[PDB]
Amino acid sequence: EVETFAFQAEIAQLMSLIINTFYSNKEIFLRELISNSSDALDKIRYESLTDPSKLDSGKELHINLIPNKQDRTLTIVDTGIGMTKADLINNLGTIAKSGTKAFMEALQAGADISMIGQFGVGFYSAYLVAEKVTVITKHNDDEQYAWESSAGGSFTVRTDTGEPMGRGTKVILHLKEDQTEYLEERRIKEIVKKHSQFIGYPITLFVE
Ligand SMILES: CCCCn1c(Cc2ccc3c(c2)OCO3)nc2c(N)ncnc21
Numbered sequence: 001e002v003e004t005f006a007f008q009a010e011i012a013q014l015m016s017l018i019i020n021t022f023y024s025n026k027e028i029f030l031r032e033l034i035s036n037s038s039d040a041l042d043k044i045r046y047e048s049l050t051d052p053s054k055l056d057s058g059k060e061l062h063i064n065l066i067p068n069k070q071d072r073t074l075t076i077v078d079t080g081i082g083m084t085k086a087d088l089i090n091n092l093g094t095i096a097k098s099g100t101k102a103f104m105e106a107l108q109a110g111a112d113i114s115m116i117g118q119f120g121v122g123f124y125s126a127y128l129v130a131e132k133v134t135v136i137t138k139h140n141d142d143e144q145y146a147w148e149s150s151a152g153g154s155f156t157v158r159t160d161t162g163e164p165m166g167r168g169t170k171v172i173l174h175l176k177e178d179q180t181e182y183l184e185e186r187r188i189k190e191i192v193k194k195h196s197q198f199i200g201y202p203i204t205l206f207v208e
Helices: 009-020 028-048 085-107 113-119 122-128 185-195
Strands: 003-006 063-068 073-078 130-138 144-149 154-159 168-175 203-205
Touching (some): 009 085, 028 073, 028 122, 028 185, 085 113, 085 154
Antiparallel strands (some): 130 168
C-alpha cells in the first residue's frame, strides 16, 4: 500500500521557489546530494566505532553516481546510515522547517540558491533538475522504504519490494526534459571535480 502525505507548508513553499525561480546555476544540486551522502557515511562510520555490528549490513563506505539515458535518471547511491520511516515522514521535515525560514530570509538580503546547503535543506535543490525524485533508503533499525515526490505539495512513502540494498540511500533523479546534460559523463566529471573534489569517500561515476 502507498501512503500519501502533505509537506509542511514551508517545505512546499521552498520546493515551489526552487522550481519557479529563474536561476541558471543548476549544477549545484549534485554537490548538495553528494554532501548529504558524505554526512550519512560519516554518521555510520562514527556509530560503528562503538558498535561494530552496525556494519553487518555492509562494510564498504562509498558513493556511486549512475546515469541512465534510457530511463532519463541520475541516481546518487551511498552506503551511509540510511533513513527510517520516521525520518521520511516527520523528522526531516521538522528539522527542515527552521532551515527553510532562514534560507528564504537570506534570499532577500541578497543570498542566492547556491547557498541552500548552508541552511540544511540542500536535498530540495534536486528539484532544480528533476521533475520527480524517488528516494530508496534502508536504515539498520528499519525496513527498506521508497519515498517519492513530484512536488505539488505531497509525497508518498511505501515499503520497498525492489532489490534489497543492505544499508544506505539512493536518490533517483527523474530529470526534466531540458536537463539531460546531467546524464553525460564529461558533464558529471566536471561538476564533481569543481564542487566535490575533497569528499572523503570514493565516488564512482558509472558509464553507460
Ligand atoms: C537533512 C540530512 C539528513 C536526511 N538525509 C538527506 C537529505 C534529505 C532530506 C529530506 C528528504 C530526503 C533526504 O529524502 C526524502 O526527504 N540525505 C540523506 C542521505 N543520503 N542519507 C541519510 N540521510 C539523508
